């Protein structure tokens, strides 16, 4: 199907990009129910800038039109044991995000689920867990609680809730 993200304002069709990566925060606390939760990054521009996969377009949560991985999805972090350091996820296959111009951007549900499954598999091996849950943003200012990006001198804010709501065993 199709996951449609509401954006304000309406991005023109030429602002369609490829998702080349994303940046996540590992949820703290215990639980210890053999599951590890992840949300889009609760950090700021320092977290984004130090992933070194961005490209020319300034964006949050998702990397648009950036560097792609060589073969497999590759995850990195300055310190896996510090839930205050973000986890840079570099994709090997980009996921196109098509802006219609009506006030929403659409991505293929199938392509996104397959990307998440590969991200979960790489996350599962790094934290030695069994279940990986993606949850929406914990909150924050509009540029960071939304997937926000720069295109043609205008700034756009898109709700990313529908992109981070799955469980993977």
């Amino acid at each position: 199907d199709t996951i449609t993200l509401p954006c304000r304002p309406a991005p023109p069709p030429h602002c369609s990009s490829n998702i080349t990566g994303l940046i996540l925060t590992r949820q703290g606390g215990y639980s210890n129910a053999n599951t590890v939760i992840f949300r889009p990054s609760g950090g700021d521009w320092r977290d984004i800038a130090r992933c070194q996969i961005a490209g020319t377009v300034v964006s949050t949560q998702l990397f648009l039109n950036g560097s792609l991985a060589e073969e497999e999805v590759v995850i990195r972090s300055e310190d896996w044991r510090d839930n205050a350091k973000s986890i840079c996820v570099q994709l090997a296959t980009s996921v196109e995000i098509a802006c219609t111009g009506a006030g929403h951007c659409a991505i293929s549900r199938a392509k996104w689920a397959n990307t998440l499954k590969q991200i979960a598999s790489k996350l599962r091996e790094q934290y030695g867990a069994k279940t990986i849950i993606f949850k929406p943003s914990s909150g924050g200012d509009p540029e960071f609680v939304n997937h926000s990006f720069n295109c043609g001198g205008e700034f756009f804010y898109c709700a990313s809730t529908q992109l981070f709501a799955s469980t993977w065993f």
Partner: antibody
């Protein structure tokens, strides 16, 4: 000199909501993450979560997801912790604490006693 | 997010004698030690496992690596009676209460 000054003691009925504040001074407020730690009377230290003052992003311990909300106002250098749906075992001293570059808490608020009772 | 275990939970030391507190994680070294007195927030004593905060008397020292860590008060003074916590990342130890043995 770095100072973290918190709001006064509160008494609240079970199921209400408390909003603790913490005003920072003497350092660049948006430059360090602010953490919240609580301590039940005679008990240990329990980490609740952090907030990034630059973006307002937060990361709560799973125990408090849904009940806790951390915010900040950069124009007055004040961080806020709000705990909702209070129970008696939420009675504790609530501390804001500023992380350092050594991943230790070198400056703490003076603490905010929150008593939950009918 | 790990679990820090502090032993012992309570420690009675004669005046002038050596006190040792142990802290191990269930998994450089970012261990910090704190001193808490009644009615007061914890006060940072040691960070990076062994670096002493400014104004902290020499009789306080920490050591250890990996998963075992130690706080040592070489000559216990009356003012050192308090609860001591270790901290690694955002997990605290349960605390060790240090008192005068008589």
């Amino acid at each position: 000199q770095v100072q973290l000054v918190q709001s006064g003691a509160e008494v609240k009925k079970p199921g209400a909501s408390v909003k603790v504040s913490c005003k920072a001074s003497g350092y660049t407020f948006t430059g360090y993450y602010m953490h919240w730690v609580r301590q039940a009377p005679g008990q240990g230290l329990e980490w609740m979560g952090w907030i990034n003052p630059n973006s307002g992003g937060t990361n709560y311990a799973q125990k408090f997801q849904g009940r806790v909300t951390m915010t900040r106002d950069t124009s007055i250098s004040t961080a806020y912790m709000e705990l909702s749906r209070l129970r008696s075992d939420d009675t504790a001293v609530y501390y804001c604490a500023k992380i350092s570059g050594s991943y230790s808490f070198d400056y703490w608020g003076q603490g905010t006693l929150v008593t939950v009772s009918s | 997010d790990i679990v820090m275990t502090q032993s012992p939970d309570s420690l009675a030391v004669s005046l002038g004698e050596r006190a040792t507190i142990n802290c191990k994680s269930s998994q450089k070294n970012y261990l910090a030690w704190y001193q808490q007195k009644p009615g007061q927030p914890p006060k940072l004593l040691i960070y990076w496992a062994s670096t002493r905060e400014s104004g902290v008397p020499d009789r306080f020292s920490g050591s250890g690596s990996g998963t075992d860590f130690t706080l040592t008060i070489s000559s216990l003074q009356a003012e050192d009676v308090a609860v001591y916590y270790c901290q690694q990342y955002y997990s605290f130890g349960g605390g060790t209460k240090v008192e005068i043995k008589r």
